[PDB]
Amino acid sequence: NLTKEQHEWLNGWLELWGAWVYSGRLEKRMSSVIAKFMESVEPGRVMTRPMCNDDDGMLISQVVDSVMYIDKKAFGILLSYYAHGSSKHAIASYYHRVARPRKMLCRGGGRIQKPSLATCRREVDEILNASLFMIYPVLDSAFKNRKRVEKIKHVA
Amino acid sequence: GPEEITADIPNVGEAALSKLDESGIVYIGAEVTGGDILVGKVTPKGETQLTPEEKLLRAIFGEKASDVKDSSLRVPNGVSGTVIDVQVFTRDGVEKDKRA
Amino acid sequence: EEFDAIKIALASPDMIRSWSFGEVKKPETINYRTFKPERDGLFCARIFGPVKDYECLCGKYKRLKHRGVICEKCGVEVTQTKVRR
Amino acid sequence: VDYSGRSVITVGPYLRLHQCGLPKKMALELFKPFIYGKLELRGLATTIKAAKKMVEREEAVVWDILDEVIREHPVLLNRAPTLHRLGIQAFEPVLIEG
Amino acid sequence: GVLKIVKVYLAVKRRIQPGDKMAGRHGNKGVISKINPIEDMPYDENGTPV
Amino acid sequence: KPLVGTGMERAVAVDSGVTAVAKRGGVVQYVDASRIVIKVNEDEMYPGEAGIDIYNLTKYTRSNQNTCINQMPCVSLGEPVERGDVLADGPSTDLGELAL
Amino acid sequence: TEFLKPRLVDIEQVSSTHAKVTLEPLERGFGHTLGNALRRILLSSMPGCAVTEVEIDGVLHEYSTKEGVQEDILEILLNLKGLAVRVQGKDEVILTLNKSGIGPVTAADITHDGDVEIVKPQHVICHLTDENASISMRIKVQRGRGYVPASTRIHSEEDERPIGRLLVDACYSPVERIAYNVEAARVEQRTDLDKLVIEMETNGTIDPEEAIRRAATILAEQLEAFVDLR
Amino acid sequence: TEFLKPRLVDIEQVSSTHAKVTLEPLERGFGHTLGNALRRILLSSMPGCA
Amino acid sequence: ATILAEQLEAFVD
Amino acid sequence: ARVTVQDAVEKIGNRFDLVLVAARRARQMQVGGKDPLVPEENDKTTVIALREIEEGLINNQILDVRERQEQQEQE
Amino acid sequence: NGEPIIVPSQDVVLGLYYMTRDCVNAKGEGMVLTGPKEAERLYRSGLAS
Ligand SMILES: [Zn+2]
């Protein structure tokens, strides 16, 4: 698969894109004006998440649109991992909650059952690894083939 | 902490800072549109005041960012047109910048 | 939510004490150092519900996992902030 | 009342009896969640934030989707003071530049 | 509580369009409904368009 | 200007306090888009002063109703103007007549 | 089918701009038709050359005031919008106007190229007043038709625009006024023929015979789609 | 400098001697010129027998 | 259209 | 049904009953995704349901017994 | 009251009054026409007012 610094660069850009997508959902908790004064005088120990400059956000959104539109399940796992901030174990347990009994042919004589947490964690990890491997080269090419807009110039 | 006017605006790109100078103020004559940043202003979200314990540990380690919340002056939507005058009044005691 | 009639009448002191959630005993509304509401004031969190969604005043209970509880430290019942009105 | 606009009125004599000329920008601001729904239905936007920014950037596919949405979707033209009941009428809008 | 104040002046240029109000001096106000081209305007015998 | 006026337009344009009328008559020495330097006549000059009036003109000052206020000069270089003549046309004036 | 064909007979220029041009002969009921169609085409879609960008030195925006000139820079841009020029060879030229000293800055002081001919050498642009005053603009002349304003141009400009390019609106069409006349043509065997007298009045740049031939070319090109496809 | 050539999109034959010859799109201010020219020619110049 | 083209036929390019 | 709903009004007998019947038909076309019996000709579901009433396929009792038929065929 | 409020107002009314009014000897008085289409053809050709 990929190496580690490539994975670090891709995970940083995708975490920024996930926090940019998560800053646009409809349902959010409401805080009154007294809560805003308390947060402005003595804020929390942990601050918020960093966002994109909205052009990198739109470009990464178009890249994942071009790649992960044929697979709804992997794209939903990717959104719930990078935007909502949930860990892989939480996504695997939520997949174990709504799991349907599928015909397996690997262990035993092909019994029917509900799949456990271990195979759920394995398929979530495999989907995330394959999704990042499919996103990386076209995202590298899209960041390469983008014109760097410079500062304004003075003609006299 | 005080709100600094500078071009070190986090989580924004060249499409908004192509008209600002190194001081955070739009050039006279730069035709702006709706949504473009005029004056680059950022409010501190952490802290600025320190103790002498934090002074010696600052000489050890360094600083942080502490400039998360951005409240820069942007053009209201629909308004356009070239900047014709920028007048920067300050207070007696605060050190000015290059644009001032 | 599906009511047939809107009945109006006079209010007994027992009914007014049944509406209320705590006796307001101080004129001062909020503080000035940090802007948290006072105790038994005109804006008090223990009487009129919490300020933020699913949070107390001191910061002990801070999630929807503790759905509805009373904080033993500051009295602020952990609910949604819709119950301030 | 939300989803509401206001502008000066002029004369269109090329119209029919059940039509009125809404501007492009004002109707884009009016029909914005409908444009969000058609953008996410046609697969041109994955998320609501991507749909929000595609409308806010005013692309040509957004104008085509707005031309499809506003077709046969009547809006009420109110004028105050509404003395009698004919001061509110519903017209099938036709997008004009202005 | 104010350190410095910056004031930026934008000079918009507002051409007329359909919708802009106009009036004479004798109370005959109105609203521009259309900008009609120079080839469509009525011309007199000399050729100057209205 | 209006082709059909009244003759009241000159009185309104002079006494509105918006143009730059000449205090003392003489010969104009330097016409600019920003200032007018006029040399006074000899008989209207006291021996105490030098006898040079510098009429600065406010160019593109914002008004209350967000319109512009600029003063374009109408007099040419080297032209004898007396006392009470409109030297700089205001926002809506044409050679000392009100032009709305 | 007893039709007759018209020809350009007389082209008399009363002035350098005003130029009356006749058309003879035309059948009964064709003079008004052809006259109105040619008048509408010549007023709408005549290609010409006009000033599009102006870069005065030391000037950022149009609402500034340069030291030395008498006219405001907006008045200079209006006087340069009113400039009439005729580019012969190219479609996009760049002129230069350098002038110092006391005196008016006429249009004849523009340092023209080998294929750019100014038609009005008395078009006063500026009024220099100071002895140490100077002005060095870099006028840009494009080629097109119609009226392209600065708002349409900054909407169609996806590339960056630098600070200094005072964007002048573009009035490309060189025909300002035109009126035809349907008189009685003098033909020795037919008394039911009407001549057409088109009394054009151009900007001094276009040729009147070239204008009529280009207008008829546009009309025939538009009627090709009516002849061919049903 | 090239114009916009129209494309005939509809001939809605209502009857055996009726037509609605829709012809779009033309340049701004050319539909009136072409329509008035064709109307005057057809009303007072088309040959036939009677 | 043929009649108008034939009338305009003279002064074309 | 695009310009005037007059013949649908004469078919129904009541403006408000026409609004209610066409609303249930348009809800069945928007939520359930049912098959419109008329060619849609790229119209919206409001005009399609109004055109179905204009022809005369949709009535209150007819749509109710059709919904009852689908319900009893579900069970 | 049961009267139409979608009514021509002042400009359509001036145009229709000028249409259906009649002069005395204007232009081409006393012909016979094959119908409404030939009347419209006569006016737009200019042989009758
Ligand atoms: Zn607590």
Curated annotation (Swiss-Prot), chain C:
Superkingdom of this protein's organism: Bacteria
Biotechnological exploitation: Co-administration of salinamide and rifampicin or salinamide and myxopyronin suppresses the emergence of resistance to both antibiotics.
Entry comment on modification after translation: Acetylated on several lysine residues in the presence of glucose.
Positions of Zn(2+) 1 binding: 56, 58, 71, 74
Purpose of the protein: DNA-dependent RNA polymerase (RNAP) catalyzes the transcription of DNA into RNA using the four ribonucleoside triphosphates as substrates.
Family: Belongs to the RNA polymerase beta' chain family.
Self-association state and partner proteins as the record states: The RNAP catalytic core consists of 2 alpha, 1 beta, 1 beta' and 1 omega subunit. When a sigma factor is associated with the core the holoenzyme is formed, which can initiate transcription. The rRNA transcription and antitermination complex (rrnTAC) consists of RNAP, NusA, NusB, NusE (rpsJ), NusG, SubB, ribosomal protein S4, DNA and precursor rRNA; S4 is more flexible than other subunits.
Protein name: DNA-directed RNA polymerase subunit beta'
Gene transcribed to yield this protein: rpoC
From Swiss-Prot, chain F:
Coverage span on the entire protein: 697 to 796 of 1342
Applied uses, from the record: Co-administration of salinamide and rifampicin or salinamide and myxopyronin suppresses the emergence of resistance to both antibiotics.
The protein's name: DNA-directed RNA polymerase subunit beta
Post-translational modification note: Acetylated on several lysine residues in the presence of glucose.
Known partners and oligomeric status: The RNAP catalytic core consists of 2 alpha, 1 beta, 1 beta' and 1 omega subunit. When a sigma factor is associated with the core the holoenzyme is formed, which can initiate transcription. The rRNA transcription and antitermination complex (rrnTAC) consists of RNAP, NusA, NusB, NusE (rpsJ), NusG, SubB, ribosomal protein S4, DNA and precursor rRNA; S4 is more flexible than other subunits. In pull-down experiments interacts with CedA. (Microbial infection) Interacts (via flap domain) with Escherichia phage lambda antitermination protein Q; this interaction renders bacterial RNAP resistant to transcription pausing and allows it to read through termination signals.
Function noted in UniProt: DNA-dependent RNA polymerase (RNAP) catalyzes the transcription of DNA into RNA using the four ribonucleoside triphosphates as substrates.
Taxonomic superkingdom: Bacteria
Protein family (similarity comment): Belongs to the RNA polymerase beta chain family.
Swiss-Prot record, chain H:
Domain of life: Bacteria
PTM remark: (Microbial infection) ADP-ribosylated on both alpha subunits by the phage T4 protein ModA. ADP-ribosylated on only one of the alpha subunits by the phage T4 protein Alt.
Free-text note on domains in this protein's UniProt record: The N-terminal domain is essential for RNAP assembly and basal transcription, whereas the C-terminal domain is involved in interaction with transcriptional regulators (such as CRP) and with upstream promoter elements.
Binding partners and assembly: Homodimer. The RNAP catalytic core consists of 2 alpha, 1 beta, 1 beta' and 1 omega subunit. When a sigma factor is associated with the core the holoenzyme is formed, which can initiate transcription. Both the N- and C-terminus interact with different regions of transcriptional regulator CRP. The rRNA transcription and antitermination complex (rrnTAC) consists of RNAP, NusA, NusB, NusE (rpsJ), NusG, SubB, ribosomal protein S4, DNA and precursor rRNA; S4 is more flexible than other subunits.
Role played: DNA-dependent RNA polymerase (RNAP) catalyzes the transcription of DNA into RNA using the four ribonucleoside triphosphates as substrates. This subunit plays an important role in subunit assembly since its dimerization is the first step in the sequential assembly of subunits to form the holoenzyme.
Family: Belongs to the RNA polymerase alpha chain family.
Swiss-Prot record, chain J:
Keyword set, alphabetical order: DNA-directed RNA polymerase, Nucleotidyltransferase, Transcription, Transferase
GO MF terms held by the record: bacterial-type RNA polymerase core enzyme binding; DNA binding; DNA-directed RNA polymerase activity
EC number(s) stated in the UniProt entry for this protein: 2.7.7.6
Catalytic activity entry: RNA(n) + a ribonucleoside 5'-triphosphate = RNA(n+1) + diphosphate
Keyword Protein biosynthesis belongs to the record: no
GO annotation, cellular component aspect: cytosol; cytosolic DNA-directed RNA polymerase complex; RNA polymerase complex; transcription elongation factor complex
GO BP annotations, alphabetical order: bacterial-type flagellum assembly; bacterial-type flagellum-dependent cell motility; cell motility; cellular response to cell envelope stress; DNA-templated transcription initiation; intracellular iron ion homeostasis; nitrate assimilation; protein-containing complex assembly
Domain of life: Bacteria
Similarity annotation: Belongs to the RNA polymerase subunit omega family.
Free-text function comment from the UniProt entry: Promotes RNA polymerase (RNAP) assembly. Latches the N- and C-terminal regions of the beta' subunit thereby facilitating its interaction with the beta and alpha subunits. Part of the processive rRNA transcription and antitermination complex (rrnTAC). The complex forms an RNA-chaperone ring around the RNA exit tunnel of RNAP. It supports rapid transcription and antitermination of rRNA operons, cotranscriptional rRNA folding, and annealing of distal rRNA regions to allow correct ribosome biogenesis.
Stretch of the intact protein here: 2 to 76 of 91
